[PDB]
């Protein structure tokens, strides 16, 4: 139920998220593009600075008036093939170097922490106030710096599959935003797109997203979703924590199989007024795929001795999730203190650095950083016993992978549907059927991915926004409008890319997309989109 206070809390969370995104964009531009800064910041430094910035900005808002507030989604910086979960701590730099010594240079940017030109940097963060969550995620491109020009500008645009992925993600994001805003004005829906008397459906959302992805030769990563958000239920841990009710459209290997052959989410819903929607879209480039294949996810572990692969990434996830349904009294006093601090956080993913009393830093000092690392040592000590009793779990690190269909079809599985991973710590990914019609389970799919010689990784571009469909009473100007809490032309401005693919104007869905764009640009007799602005700092 939308109200003045709920809308204000959502707006404050969105403003803080936009300001944090502006802060990280400025930091990255100073570190690698303007090159004015003497010292180049690394990925853990950027993540820690972002978390501290979010906490310091949120400290001034709703003090002693809202019970619970804080970071909803920890700041995640994902590079190229990494599709999520990359928020390494500051005390893991030497560990990462030692773990990945003797490996390839494919994950060199993530291992070293230093960005490289041509990298797709995906920045994701979320802020919640009283359980009302606003989340933003933006893909940007790292460029080499021109020297002859008086003004700092890239030497040239991004070309290739990364450009295809960025264009597909941006176009899909804008089109889905326009389509959801069309739900408040059902008579403004294009006829070729769908029924004039009919509303907005998950089928229409899915077919628009699939049309754009197929036009740009990209796949939808199995984590993408367009769902409804309520209080304390934002899908901050979708693959970890189960939910009673779900309203949205998801993409999986099962959906890929069904499209090829043409709690459970279903695309049989109508978008309603007065609702909050999160749109997270990940597009994986299919430039190097000369065959027809399947897009899947590989989980990154911290064990170097599990295989001998040269192009394997070894890392430890930086974010944890507390399971409040599990109770166990710990033997270590440090572990009990850490569990009390973790319970003081809430139901959102947290970092170990977030639990330090020094964090967030008031004045950024070397001694402050040393005190933070000293706290982190004992935090790791306590976390070892906390995780050993299933009280907390990890948010995984996932890499997009491509598996050809012919290998899957030629594969044999003597168990079929009955097989499942019995060694999985988590219930939800352990009991999964990514190929229900072929009877191939998750463990069998991972076995095929590891056994195949042509299993490559795919670069991923991500765009994720949060919107509210304000009705006539909720809205300021007595007419329904879409409040985009995160994203827009000010924070999520597209980078310089060029792609050889484009939408094909001879298709009805493409014409509907064009009409959606035209009606979104029309501010008088079209759709009304109000974007949340970032608050000023200096």
């Amino acid at each position: 139920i939308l109200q003045e206070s709920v809308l204000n809390k959502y707006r404050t969370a969105g403003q803080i998220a936009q300001t944090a995104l502006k802060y990280v964009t400025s930091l990255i531009n100073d570190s690698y593009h303007s090159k004015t800064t003497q010292r180049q910041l690394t990925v853990p430094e950027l993540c820690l600075l972002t978390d501290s910035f979010i906490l310091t900005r949120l400290e001034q808002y709703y003090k002693n008036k809202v019970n619970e507030r804080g970071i909803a989604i920890p700041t995640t910086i994902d590079i190229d093939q990494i599709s999520g979960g990359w928020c390494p701590e500051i005390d893991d730099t030497q560990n990462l170097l030692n773990w990945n010594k003797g490996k390839d240079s494919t994950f060199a940017s993530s291992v070293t922490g230093t960005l490289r030109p041509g990298d797709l940097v995906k920045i994701t963060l979320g802020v919640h106030i009283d359980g009302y969550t606003s989340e933003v995620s933006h893909t940007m491109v790292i460029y080499p710096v021109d020297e002859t020009k008086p003004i700092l500008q890239p030497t040239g645009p991004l070309l290739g599959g990364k450009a295809d992925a960025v264009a597909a993600a941006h176009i899909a994001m804008e089109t889905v935003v326009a389509l959801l805003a069309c739900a408040l004005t059902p008579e403004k829906l294009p006829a070729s797109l769908g029924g004039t008397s009919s509303g907005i459906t998950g089928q229409l959302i899915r077919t628009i997203v699939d049309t754009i992805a197929r036009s740009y030769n990209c796949g939808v990563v199995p984590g993408s979703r367009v769902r409804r958000i309520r209080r304390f239920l934002a899908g901050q841990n979708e693959g970890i924590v189960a939910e009673r009710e779900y309203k949205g459209v998801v993409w999986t290997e099962s959906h890929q199989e069904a499209d090829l052959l043409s709690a459970i989410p279903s695309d049989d819903f109508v978008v309603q007024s007065g609702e909050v929607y999160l749109i997270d879209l990940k597009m994986a480039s299919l430039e190097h795929c000369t065959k027809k294949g399947l897009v899947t996810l590989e989980t990154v572990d911290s064990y170097t001795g599990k295989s001998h692969k040269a192009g394997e990434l070894i890392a430890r996830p930086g974010a944890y999730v507390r399971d409040f349904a599990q109770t166990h009294i710990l033997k270590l006093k440090t572990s009990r203190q850490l569990l009390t601090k973790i319970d003081k956080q809430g139901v959102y993913p947290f970092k170990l650095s977030h639990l330090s009393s020094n964090f967030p830093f008031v004045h950024e000092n070397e001694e402050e950083l040393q005190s933070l690392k000293k706290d982190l040592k004992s935090f790791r000590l306590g976390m070892s016993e906390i995780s050993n009793n299933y009280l907390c779990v990890e948010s995984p690190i996932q890499i997009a992978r491509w598996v050809p269909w012919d290998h899957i079809l030629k594969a044999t599985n003597p168990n079929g549907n009955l097989s499942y991973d019995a060694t999985s710590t988590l219930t939800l990914p352990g009991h999964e059927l990514p190929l229900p019609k072929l009877g191939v389970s998750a463990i069998k799919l991972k076995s095929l991915m590891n056994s195949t010689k042509e299993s490559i990784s795919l670069p991923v571009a991500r765009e994720c926004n949060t919107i509210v469909l304000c009705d006539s009473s909720v809205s300021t100007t007595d007419r329904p409008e879409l409040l985009r809490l995160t994203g827009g032309s000010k924070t999520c401005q597209p980078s310089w890319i060029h792609s050889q693919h484009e939408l094909n104007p001879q298709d009805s869905i493409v014409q509907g997309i064009f009409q959606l764009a035209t009606l979104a640009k029309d501010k008088r007799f079209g759709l009304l989109l109000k974007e949340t602005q970032p608050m000023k700092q200096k």
Partner: peptide, 26 residues
Amino acid sequence: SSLTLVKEALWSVIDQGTTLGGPFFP
């Protein structure tokens, strides 16, 4: 067999442009 039919169907099925941004750093 239904699995045979599904596998046969899958086997038989598998058998300017655009420009965003500009010359600057956002």
